[PDB]
Amino acid sequence: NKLDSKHSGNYDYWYRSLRKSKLKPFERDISTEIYQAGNKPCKGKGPNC
C-alpha cells in the first residue's frame, strides 16, 4: 500500500476478466482483444462487447 497507492488512483495495473476459456496453469495472456458475448460480431465498445 505504501509503495503502489496513489491518491488519484492507480490505473497503471490491470487484470483480465473476460475471455472465452479459462487459462491452463502457467499460461500468460497479453492480448487486449475485445470480448464477444453470444454470436454477434464485435467491432468496438457496445452491447455484448
Binding site: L18, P47, N48
Partner: protein
Amino acid sequence: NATTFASVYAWNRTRISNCVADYSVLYNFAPFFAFKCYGVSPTKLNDL
C-alpha cells in the same frame, strides 16, 4: 422495462425466486453501458 423508476434514496427492492433466470435477454439489451460483476464470472451466470 418499468415505465417509472424509484429515486436513489428510495430505491425499490424486489425479490425473485422459484424461477429460471434467463441472462441472454439481459445481454440482449443495447443501451447497456456499465456492467460490472464482483465475485462471480458474468458469463457463468447461466450455469451458477
